[PDB]
């Protein structure tokens, strides 16, 4: 292009690089805080899951009501966080419907809703937004569980998909089963537990639902902040390479313009 085109492009890319550096720093701070808050929530959620893996509960193979919960955020620029979760959700939903089930979906975060608003647009039991603006609390998980129970879709089996945070550079997508008390009552491993009618067990199921949702929220937010830090770092690096190339081009063009104007002056002077 001409010199002004190159100058404007170079200035724009420089601004973009500045912004991405700042956002990487912000995301890194929020990540440090999220890890710090994730350790205790990690122990708490693992404890809350203790029972089911200790008293092995097999879901009944004769029920059609299933629930899929997919945990993400509203924020973008986090790489393949929402993408992986939505991909696995549609995989599992397709499998369930091929097995002849009646799947619903809860989307914790806009981006999940958006990715799945073309297909699975009618299975949305309810979706939640305003995620990711502030670190998730137990209040959020309590609200999600409360609106899941209140909305009278009594499900017979459940699953939650979140991005388990492995390391600052890596994360994995999990699927943690959720059971309804119909499956806990009729489980022979549960015959050993004492002082257990079908009412205390119902309160216990409601609490465990809140617990698992909260655990998934903490893991997901940690992994998302890590991914946003990585994505911003890569974007800043790409902007730096582009800035180098455009600076070289700008210098070439500036010298060429100087030479062109000077040759015009010389030709005019010698052509008198």
């Amino acid at each position: 292009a001409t010199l002004k085109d190159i100058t404007r492009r170079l200035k724009s890319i420089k601004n973009i690089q500045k912004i991405t550096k700042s956002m990487k720093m912000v995301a890194a701070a929020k990540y440090a805080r999220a890890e710090r808050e994730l350790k205790p929530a990690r122990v708490y959620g693992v404890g809350s899951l203790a029972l089911y893996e200790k008293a092995d509960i097999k879901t009944p193979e004769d029920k059609k009501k299933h629930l899929i919960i997919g945990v993400s955020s509203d924020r973008g620029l986090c790489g393949a966080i929402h993408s992986s979760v939505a991909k696995q959700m549609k995989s599992e939903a397709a499998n369930l419907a091929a097995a002849g089930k009646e799947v619903k979906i809860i989307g914790v975060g806009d981006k999940i809703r958006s990715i799945l608003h073309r297909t699975h647009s009618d299975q949305f039991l309810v979706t939640f937004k305003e995620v990711g603006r502030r670190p998730p609390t137990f209040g959020d998980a309590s609200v999600i569980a409360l609106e899941l129970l209140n909305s009278g879709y009594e499900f017979d089996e459940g699953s939650i998909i979140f991005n388990r945070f492995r390391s600052v550079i890596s994360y994995k997508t999990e699927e943690k089963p959720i059971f309804s008390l119909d499956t806990i009552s009729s489980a022979e491993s549960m015959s050993i537990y004492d002082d257990i009618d079908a009412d205390v067990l119902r309160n216990y199921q409601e609490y465990s639902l809140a617990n698992i949702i909260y655990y998934s929220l903490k893991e997901s937010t940690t992994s998302e902040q890590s991914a946003r830090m990585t994505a911003m770092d890569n974007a800043s690096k790409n902007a730096s390479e582009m800035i180098d190339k455009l600076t070289l081009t700008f210098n070439r063009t500036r010298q060429a313009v100087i030479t062109k104007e000077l040759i015009e002056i010389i030709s005019g002077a010698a052509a008198l």
Partner: protein
């Protein structure tokens, strides 16, 4: 060679149009909400 504020929308490349749209959609939404509230206030203040 330096950079200055409000340069992304001065170039007018892809980021400029993307930013312009990201602004316009949001403020159309908020204008719709505010117009609904204005209509509600109009009706509620007739008496």
């Amino acid at each position: 060679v330096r950079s200055s504020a409000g340069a992304v929308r001065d170039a007018g490349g892809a980021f400029g149009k993307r930013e312009q749209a990201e602004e316009e959609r949001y403020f159309r939404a908020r204008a719709k909400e505010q117009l609904a509230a204005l209509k509600k206030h109009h009706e509620n203040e007739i008496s």
